[PDB]
Design a protein around this ligand. Sequence first.
Ligand SMILES: Cc1cc2nc3c(=O)[nH]c(=O)nc-3n(C[C@H](O)[C@H](O)[C@H](O)COP(=O)(O)OP(=O)(O)OC[C@H]3O[C@@H](n4cnc5c(N)ncnc54)[C@H](O)[C@@H]3O)c2cc1C
Length: 398
Amino acid sequence: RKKVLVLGAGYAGLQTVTKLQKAISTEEAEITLINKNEYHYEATWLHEASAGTLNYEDVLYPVESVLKKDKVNFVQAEVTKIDRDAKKVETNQGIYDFDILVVALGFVSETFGIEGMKDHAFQIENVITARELSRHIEDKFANYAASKEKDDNDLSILVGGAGFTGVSFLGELTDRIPELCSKYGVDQNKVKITCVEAAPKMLPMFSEELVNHAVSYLEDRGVEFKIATPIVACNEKGFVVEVDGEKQQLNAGTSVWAAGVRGSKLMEESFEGVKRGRIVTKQDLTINGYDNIFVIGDCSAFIPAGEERPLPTTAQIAMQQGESVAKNIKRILNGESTEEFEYVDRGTVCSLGSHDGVGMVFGKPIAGKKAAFMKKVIDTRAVFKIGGIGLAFKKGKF
Ligand SMILES: Cc1cc2nc3c(=O)[nH]c(=O)nc-3n(C[C@H](O)[C@H](O)[C@H](O)COP(=O)(O)OP(=O)(O)OC[C@H]3O[C@@H](n4cnc5c(N)ncnc54)[C@H](O)[C@@H]3O)c2cc1C
């Protein structure tokens, strides 16, 4: 009975387990799933939980509810060390041995060595960061309303990055901010929402026509964009940016970083050839020198056969990688060879509030209500693909 140890119960990790548990026999292998929290959270919905347009409990479900418990041991613990050669994983709740390992430990914020960006800004990482940020935003409207002398800077919000995560967040803020203005007695004209992006283009994965749609939607709803503008620091007051190479202080009571992510810090400590918590895997999703270790999700850099650059970090690729790993573990267990991973680009949608969005679905571009609808299908399909129709019914977007 070989030991299959899965690290992380995210999109990649939990998908590997819920597929594998259907395939193997109790005599074939023993599965162990280690996760920090008792729940699985929908990281792709953290823009809503962070803005406060959704209750945090709606973006998560208990891990054990989708497990076949005669085949999987759920361990709630934090992975502290991974010994690739000794075949051991240390946690705050004990050491666990392995025959096969699946590293699916996800991502964390990456601030590109920008001084004060982790300390003085709120990140978009998990349910705990989301809860802290939505409460902070509302507390700023509440404290503003409470003060006799009103500082309109308490209501100024800075968002670092105009990519997928940045735009999704701005979209939720445009639904939330009017509601808080009305509740706390504030005029919307006093609220300032500024998106700063160092790159020369916003949402670089989409057409100019789709980006023009996103920009017009957010600009009409009070967002100002400062693109191709580097963020050289973050302090108590807000961000320090360069404009024509001249440092300028931008003030804001809330500074949110959404411009970069990296794989788990455990990656550099545990494996060789790691660049910002990502490891370039072999085509079957194993790592160089270890036919018994798989690294998937945001901890991986899968370069497709014909190409040179790795595919981007997404929950879509993560889930597809987990389905691959589950089949290849069964093949390994039965003395068979592994098959290569082939990513199927079904397209995606960046939300723009509750009733809008920009995306590519079936290879054709989509916007507005059709995008909002398809975003609910993609989000509900991801609950379905891990836990089935009942969980999709209970926790989906329909
Ligand atoms: C707001 C937002 C919107 C996004 N929208 C999209 C979208 O529309 N489509 C899309 O495809 N992608 C989207 N993404 C990207 C997507 O969320 C990630 O690529 C995805 O989360 C990667 O899944 P994963 O399994 O690798 O990691 P994760 O989702 O990060 O899960 C890792 C799990 O491991 C646990 N863990 C981490 N470290 C430890 C440790 N040391 N010990 C134990 N447990 C640990 C975590 O608690 C978590 O349960 C978005 C991301 C964000 C933040």
